[PDB]
């Protein structure tokens, strides 16, 4: 359990230790792995951006799936600033409040 240090981690908006990753744009998910490291490509009409992922960490999105902006690709806590610059302010409010209340 994360607990009080997590509450502090939230109220201070501090970089999560087990940082998940979020899509900066809206596009399809194309998973590519030769066996070295894992790469997850969020690709769209005008933009193609790839995410470097460690082979060990697991993810929430199967290949070919649609992802909204700021939608977490991997499992873990989410860096507030990232989703602020991704999804926008209201979603940040929602996440912060819901996590504090989760604890």
Asked if 36 contacts 53 with a C-beta cutoff of 8 angstroms, the reply is no
Q: How was this structure determined?
A: X-ray
DSSP for residue 74: B
Resolution given for this structure, in angstroms: 4.0
- The residues near 96 (Cβ < 8 Å, ≥ 6 apart) are 10, 13, 80
Backbone angles phi, psi at 27, to 5 degrees: -165, 180
Q: Give CA–CA dist 46/60, Å, rounded.
A: 24
Distances (CA, A) of 20 to 45, 51, 56: 25, 11, 13
């Amino acid at each position: 359990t994360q607990g009080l240090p997590r509450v502090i981690e939230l109220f201070e908006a501090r970089r999560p230790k087990a940082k998940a990753v979020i899509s900066e744009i809206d596009g399809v998910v194309r998973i590519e792995e030769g066996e070295d490291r894992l790469s997850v490509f969020v690709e769209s009409e005008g933009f193609s951006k790839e995410y470097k992922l460690p082979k060990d960490a697991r993810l929430l999105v199967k290949d070919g799936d649609y992802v909204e902006a700021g939608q977490p690709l991997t499992r873990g806590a989410i860096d507030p600033h990232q989703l602020l610059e991704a999804k926008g302010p209201e979603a940040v409010e929602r996440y912060l409040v819901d996590e504090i209340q989760k604890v």
